[PDB]
C-alpha cells in the first residue's frame, strides 16, 4: 500500500497540509481550536461547537481561541487530534487517513514523550499505514537543493540552528531557544497596553499578530533609534479605530536579539547562529558561515537579515565571507522539502510501518528518526 503520501508540516503558529510532489501547500491555516464564548439562543447558528481553519478566522469574535502547541510541544492532545482530523476531513483534504503514508514534522530536541504520543495518535486513533518524523533544517535544505547549510529558522514557537554539512546533521551542535514569533507578539501586546490600547481576549490577540506581521521593522542600531524620537505610524483595526503604534513597532522584534527584554536570559537568534557554527568542528566552520539559510515567519521582519549580518560580523572571526541566504518561499520551505523527500524512492525505507510499530513500539520510532 504505497499511495501518494501526505505532508503535515506541524507548528504552533501555522499548520501546512497537502500531497507529495507539489510546488506549494494547497492547505495552509493557523494551528488553533476555536470554541464559542457566548450562548446560541437563535436557531440556524454556526453548528459543530468546534471551529478550525477559515471558519475560525472568519468568526474570531465568538470563539475563545486556544493554541494547543506551545514551543513545538502540544499541551492539549485532544485539540491536536481534532485539528489533524479536520485536516483529513472533507473540509480540506477530502481523503481517508488509511490510504496515504504520513510525513510528520517536529522541532529538534523536543520531549520524546510527545513524539511517542504523536505516533500513538496517527497509528491508533487514525489508522495510518506508515508514519515518518523529520526535522525542520533537513527539509529546508531539501527545498533549496543544497546539502551544506546552517538553517537559522524562526517560527511562532521555536527558534533554532542545526548545522548540516554535506548530509551530516551534527546533533550536539544544535542550539535551541523557546523565544520566537508568539513571544514577540505577546511582547508587542504588553507594549501596546503601556502605550494605551489594551487587548486581552484570545480572539483579540490575533489583531496583535496582524499588527506585528504588517507594521514592524528591525533597527540596525537600536541605541540610535532610542535617542531619536519616532514618527508614530498609524494602523486601522477591523473595528476602524486608529492606533498610533509609536516606538513599540521597532522595540517588539528586539526580543529576538535581546531576550533579556521579556526577562528570560537566553542566547538570542544571532548568538544561536554563531554558537551553532562554533560548536561544530574546526574545518567545517568556514563552509557553515558561507551557507547560512533562513526560514520561518519571524525572519520576515524588515531589516532582519541586514541586522543578522551585522551581528555575525561583530561576533565571528574577521575577514570571513558571510552569506545569509533566504529563499522567496521561506514560510513553506519546510513543507516543500517534505514534499520532495516524500516523492523520492528512498522515502519507503526511512518510514515506520504500522506492522513494525505493533511489533516493537516506541523504540523502533526512536531508532528510525536517528
Amino acid at each position: 500500500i504505497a499511495n501518494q503520501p501526505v505532508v503535515i508540516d506541524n507548528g504552533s503558529g501555522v499548520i501546512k497540509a497537502g500531497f507529495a510532489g507539489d510546488q506549494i501547500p494547497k492547505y495552509c491555516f493557523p494551528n488553533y481550536v476555536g470554541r464559542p464564548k457566548h450562548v446560541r439562543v437563535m436557531a440556524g447558528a454556526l453548528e459543530g461547537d468546534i471551529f478550525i481553519g477559515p471558519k475560525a478566522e472568519e468568526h474570531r469574535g465568538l470563539l475563545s481561541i486556544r493554541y494547543p502547541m506551545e514551543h513545538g510541544i502540544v499541551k492539549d492532545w485532544n485539540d491536536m487530534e481534532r485539528i489533524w482530523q479536520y485536516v483529513y476531513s472533507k473540509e480540506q483534504l477530502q481523503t481517508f487517513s488509511e490510504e496515504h503514508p504520513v510525513l510528520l514534522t517536529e522541532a529538534p530536541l523536543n520531549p520524546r514523550k510527545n513524539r511517542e504520543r504523536a505516533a500513538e495518535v496517527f497509528f491508533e486513533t487514525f489508522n495510518v499505514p506508515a508514519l515518518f518524523i523529520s526535522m525542520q533544517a533537513v527539509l529546508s535544505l531539501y527545498a533549496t537543493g543544497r546539502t551544506t547549510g546552517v538553517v537559522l529558522d524562526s517560527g511562532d514557537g521555536v527558534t533554532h540552528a542545526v548545522p548540516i554539512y554535506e548530509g551530516f546533521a551534527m546533533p550536539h551542535s544544535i542550539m535551541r531557544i523557546d523565544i520566537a514569533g508568539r513571544d514577540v507578539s505577546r511582547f508587542l501586546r504588553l507594549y501596546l497596553r503601556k502605550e494605551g490600547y489594551d487587548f486581552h481576549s484570545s480572539s483579540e490577540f490575533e489583531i496583535v499578530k496582524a499588527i506585528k506581521e504588517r507594521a514592524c521593522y528591525l533597527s540596525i542600531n537600536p541605541q540610535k533609534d532610542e535617542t531619536l524620537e519616532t514618527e508614530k505610524a498609524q494602523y486601522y483595526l477591523p473595528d476602524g479605530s486608529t492606533i498610533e503604534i509609536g516606538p513599540s513597532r521597532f522595540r517588539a522584534p528586539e526580543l529576538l536579539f535581546r531576550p533579556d527584554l521579556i526577562g528570560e536570559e537566553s542566547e538570542g537568534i544571532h548568538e544561536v547562529l554563531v554558537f551553532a557554527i562554533q560548536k561544530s568542528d574546526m574545518d567545517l566552520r568556514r563552509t557553515l558561515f558561507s551557507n547560512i539559510v533562513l526560514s520561518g515567519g519571524s525572519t520576515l521582519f524588515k531589516g532582519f537579515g541586514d541586522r543578522l549580518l551585522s551581528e555575525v560580523k561583530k561576533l565571528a572571526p574577521k575577514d570571513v565571507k558571510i552569506r545569509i541566504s533566504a529563499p522567496q518561499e521561506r514560510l513553506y520551505s519546510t513543507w516543500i522539502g517534505g514534499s520532495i523527500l516524500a516523492s523520492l524512492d528512498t522515502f519507503k525505507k526511512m518510514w515506520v510501518s504500522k506492522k513494525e510499530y505493533e511489533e516493537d513500539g516506541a523504540r523502533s520510532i526512536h531508532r528510525k528518526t536517528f
Binding site: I24, C28, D306, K321, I324, Q328
Partner: peptide, 20 residues
C-alpha cells in the same frame, strides 16, 4: 506564486564582498 504571504524586494541573500 499563489498564497497569502510573500516579501517583494528583500532578495534571496545578503552577502559580504569577496576580497583577494
Amino acid at each position: 506564486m499563489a498564497d497569502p504571504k510573500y516579501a517583494d524586494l528583500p532578495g534571496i541573500a545578503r552577502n559580504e564582498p569577496d576580497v583577494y
